[PDB]
Design a binder for this molecule. Structure first.
Ligand SMILES: COc1ccccc1NC(=O)N1CCC[C@H](C(N)=O)C1
Ligand SMILES: [Zn+2]
Length: 138
């Protein structure tokens, strides 16, 4: 679990969005596993606008943060799950690091701000949905 709170927006994994997220929908994209909903309170986070390929992510299954080197946002095949058929997920960044399914929503940050959230993983890999291209979040 986890979310980004920026301005009057909440950014979550689309597959973990709540009934309230869908009732206050701003934008969603199944191919990116992202959903953005509107909030009444002002958010605590700021978004990176950069080309960093290193950063630190929060891993809830270890209660710890880990440093990572990650690939540039790309189209990656993701196997079927209970949430989606087998498909290509876009704007995904992969890295070597521990993750389990419930780690989705953990934030990846570089020195500039929030880069994205955990969205995929397996066998010593962790994948992050990029948010740096969503300029309207600002
Ligand atoms: C962090 O996720 C994992 C880690 C280790 C093992 C498995 C996972 N599950 C995982 O990759 N997905 C399940 C939920 C929806 C995901 C998606 N974006 O399509 C895919
Ligand atoms: Zn950066």
């Amino acid at each position: 679990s986890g979310a980004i709170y920026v301005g009057n927006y909440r950014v979550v994994n689309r597959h973990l969005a709540t009934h309230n997220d869908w009732a206050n929908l701003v934008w969603e994209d199944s191919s990116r596993d992202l959903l953005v909903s509107s909030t009444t309170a002002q958010g605590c986070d700021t978004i990176a606008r950069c080309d960093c390929q290193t950063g630190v992510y929060y891993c809830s299954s270890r209660r710890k943060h880990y440093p990572v080197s990650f690939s540039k946002p790309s189209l990656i095949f993701v196997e079927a799950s209970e949430y989606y058929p087998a498909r290509y997920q876009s704007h995904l960044m992969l890295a070597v690091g521990h993750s389990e399914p419930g780690d989705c929503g953990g934030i990846l940050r570089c020195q500039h701000g929030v880069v994205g959230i955990v969205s995929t993983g397996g066998n010593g890999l962790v994948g992050f949905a990029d948010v740096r291209d969503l300029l309207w979040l600002d």
